[PDB]
Design a binder for this molecule. Structure first.
Ligand SMILES: CCCCCCCCCCCCCC(=O)SCCNC(=O)CCNC(=O)[C@H](O)C(C)(C)COP(=O)(O)OP(=O)(O)OC[C@H]1O[C@@H](n2cnc3c(N)ncnc32)[C@H](O)[C@@H]1OP(=O)(O)O
Ligand SMILES: CN(CCC#N)c1nc(N(C)C2CCNCC2)nc2ccsc12
Ligand SMILES: CN(CCC#N)c1nc(N(C)C2CCNCC2)nc2ccsc12
Ligand SMILES: [Mg+2]
Length: 411
């Protein structure tokens, strides 16, 4: 059933995943010295290429591959259009490894054919709370705690093969080469997400969407109008009214995050993330990189009253090409990022996220049901979509957890 995934150190079935009781590695211990020093073999008409993702022109070359060949829906209505600025932000965080950015080009004329990218992340990925309780009940606490320390691993994203090269077994070669380059730096686990079901997720959540510009969403067929709206004289007017928002934020003291806020935002974020079974650990440098505002890319606001930062939220921008429509070229989506609330309820904090995103010309707000995202769905008028995000580890046995026990946002 899976000619490639059956050869890899991942759980092979749900059932297998149902026997997993402690976090830990799948494969035998290996050293850097055991890992091939030469690149994985590839056909003579192709070559490996390491783009420099801080150099405008190489970022542009990767941006065009993804614009034309990255994820699209099944009806081919929308395709992601991650911006050049977003790609530099996502793939060059503090201490990134340039060698983990891996491309294939056609050797004759250098046509870009494929990409995959890894970045470092410091992840809490030890045995989850409900399984540590089982371990206590059995006298097995030492084995359950073995891998509690946060681990320096690889986050994989942006796997893409050109549409003309589909179904030729190029993605397995990309994945093996990326695994070799990560292993040559003495890293042995990765985390990744996909919409598709592969062997075997440790967590799965539905996507949720909150309409900000419902007339455009309906025009482009992102949205339909629920059937009940047909009992009105003016279904579209009633839909627009339903999703109307304030024109300015409601929380006293909301403002954009600035560099001086980094230590307090780090403290309140890390205290909050600690409560989830799987979640990242960020240094000051990483808080600065992932949360300070960046035009067109990431938007972050703190609540400061009386000179103290008590809450914050962030969102990022991923546009999509609207493939078929004649009225619109782009869908402008805002995605819920990290947040923390200590002074107000989360619904009250996230309402201001929707207000700011709407004021800035976003069409929809998207999120997965990770973190405490379920706690504001109904009041803030999010609805579940048809999509899911499934969370996977490479070379890590892990019990199944609920998506509300995941605190890692994946771009
Ligand atoms: C320690 C360090 C470890 C580092 C590595 C950790 C692992 C990272 C793993 C990657 C995490 C990526 C996270 C993201 O970026 S998820 C986003 C993935 N990108 C897209 O969806 C963009 C549009 N599609 C494409 O570009 C191609 O269809 C891709 C490249 C997806 C497959 O190309 P193609 O369609 O031309 O097929 P093939 O003949 O070459 O290969 C077929 C094999 O590929 C398996 N396949 C299909 N889709 C995925 C998928 N999303 N993740 C993993 N495997 C996938 C499939 O089951 C089959 O294996 P098996 O069923 O036969 O066994
Ligand atoms: C590239 N974009 C646009 C993302 C946004 N905003 C996609 N949008 C949707 N949708 C907008 C769904 C939302 C729920 N209803 C059906 C369309 N589904 C998929 C599935 C694979 S990619 C993709
Ligand atoms: C249904 N999927 C998963 C597709 C894949 N892989 C979606 N993914 C994202 N993303 C931005 C993903 C893209 C892949 N990396 C993680 C985020 N946005 C939306 C918006 C509506 S549906 C949807
Ligand atoms: Mg292929």
């Amino acid at each position: 059933a899976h000619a490639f995934w059956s050869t890899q150190p991942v759980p092979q079935t749900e059932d297998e995943t149902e026997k997993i009781v402690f976090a830990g590695p799948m494969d035998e211990p290996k050293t850097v010295a055991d890992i091939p020093e030469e690149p994985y073999p590839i056909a003579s008409t192709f070559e490996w290429w390491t783009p420099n993702m801080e150099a405008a022109d190489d970022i542009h070359a990767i941006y065009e591959l993804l614009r034309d060949n990255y994820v699209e829906d099944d009806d081919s209505m929308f395709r992601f259009n991650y911006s050049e600025e977003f790609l530099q932000w996502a793939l060059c965080p503090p201490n990134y490894i340039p060698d983990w950015h891996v491309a294939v080009r056609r050797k004759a004329d250098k046509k870009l054919l494929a990409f995959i990218a890894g970045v470092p992340v410091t992840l809490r990925m030890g045995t989850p709370k409900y399984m540590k309780v089982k371990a206590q009940e059995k006298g097995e606490g030492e084995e359950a705690a073995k891998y509690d320390e946060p681990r320096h691993i690889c986050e994989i994203n942006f796997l893409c093969v050109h549409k003309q090269l589909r179904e030729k077994r190029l993605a397995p070669i990309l994945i093996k080469e990326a695994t070799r380059r990560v292993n040559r730096t003495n890293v042995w686990q990765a985390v990744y997400t996909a919409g598709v079901l592969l062997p075997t997720p440790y967590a799965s959540g539905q996507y949720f969407h909150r309409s900000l510009n419902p007339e455009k969403l309906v025009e482009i067929r992102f949205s339909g109008i629920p059937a009940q709206y047909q009992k009105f004289q003016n279904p579209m007017a009633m839909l627009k009214r339903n999703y109307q928002l304030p024109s300015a934020p409601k929380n006293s003291g909301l403002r954009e995050m600035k560099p001086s806020d980094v230590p307090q935002v780090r403290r309140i974020l890390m205290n909050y993330l600690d409560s989830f079974d799987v979640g990242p650990v960020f240094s000051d440098a990483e808080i600065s990189h992932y949360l300070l505002p960046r035009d067109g890319v990431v938007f972050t606001y703190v609540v400061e009253n009386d000179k103290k930062v008590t809450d914050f939220f962030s969102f990022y921008r991923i546009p999509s090409t609207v493939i078929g429509n004649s009225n619109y070229n782009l869908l402008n989506a805002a995605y819920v990022h990290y947040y923390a609330a200590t002074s107000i309820p989360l619904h009250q904090l996230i309402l201001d996220l929707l207000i700011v995103a709407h004021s800035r010309g976003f069409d929809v707000c998207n999120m997965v049901e990770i973190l405490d995202n379920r706690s504001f769905v109904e009041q803030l008028k999010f609805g579940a979509g048809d999509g899911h995000l499934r969370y996977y580890f490479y070379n890590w046995a892990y019990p199944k957890i609920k998506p509300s026990q995941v605190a890692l946002v994946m771009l």
